[PDB]
């Protein structure tokens, strides 16, 4: 139904551009946004993500398999400036979790960010949150470069070798709680950001 394993549920995800007009006025543009699931054979995407060491094939083999999703974004790129990322997770357990985000060009890791997040109790469950985390410089320049390509065919061709892997882990037990693979296209002119969510299998 949703991006949820037995132990973690992603409630919200977004990457955005924020501009301050005056001290009382803000404008925000969402590049991508998440607030029955077809499946995708994980062997079809192995080469788009790093392997060898902490690889995507090794991660899935160790499982659990109900924690591996693929998100396909049609990103809206139609736009001093703050570039950020926000996410929110729910769990029925109070744990200390770790989020590893790896940006890859051509299946080769290029940026890595690790973050630790703690729970807040709310109405019987536990919330984890990344708020207005600064988008790193590689991504900001990549977006600027994308917007400078001559046509959407060149942007989407470039984006075919751009992926992000997110692994969320229980810091104590090292259990994989959520693993999300992200593939991207540019949304078509006045379509706005859209996505499909898949379960990864086999």
């Amino acid at each position: 139904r949703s991006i949820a394993s037995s132990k973690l549920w992603m409630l919200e995800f977004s990457a955005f551009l924020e501009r301050q007009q005056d001290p009382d006025t803000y404008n925000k543009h969402l590049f991508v946004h998440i607030s029955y699931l077809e499946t995708v054979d994980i062997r079809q995407i192995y080469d788009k993500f790093p392997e060898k060491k902490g690889g995507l094939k090794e991660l899935f083999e160790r499982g659990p398999s109900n924690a591996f999703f693929l998100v396909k974004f049609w990103a809206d790129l139609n736009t001093s400036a703050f570039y950020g990322v926000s996410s929110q997770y729910e769990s029925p357990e109070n744990m200390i979790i770790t989020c590893s985000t790896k940006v890859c060009s051509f299946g080769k890791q290029v940026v890595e960010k690790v973050e630790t997040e703690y729970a807040r109790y709310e109405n019987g469950h536990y919330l984890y949150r990344i708020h207005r985390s600064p988008l790193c410089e590689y991504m900001i320049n990549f977006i600027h470069k994308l917007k400078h390509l001559p046509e959407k065919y060149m942007m989407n061709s470039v984006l075919e070798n751009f992926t992000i892997l997110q692994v969320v882990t229980n810091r104590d037990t090292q259990e994989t709680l959520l693993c999300i693979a992200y593939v991207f296209e540019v949304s078509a002119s006045e379509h706005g950001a859209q996505h499909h969510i898949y379960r990864l299998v086999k």
């Binding site: 077809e38 995708v40 054979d41 079809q44 049609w74 075919e160 379509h191 859209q194 499909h196 898949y198």
Partner: peptide
């Protein structure tokens, strides 16, 4: 490089909502 559209993916993969 094997193009993504020649790989076996659900048809939805290229159908933007």
């Amino acid at each position: 490089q094997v193009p993504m559209r020649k790989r076996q993916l659900p048809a939805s993969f290229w159908e933007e909502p």
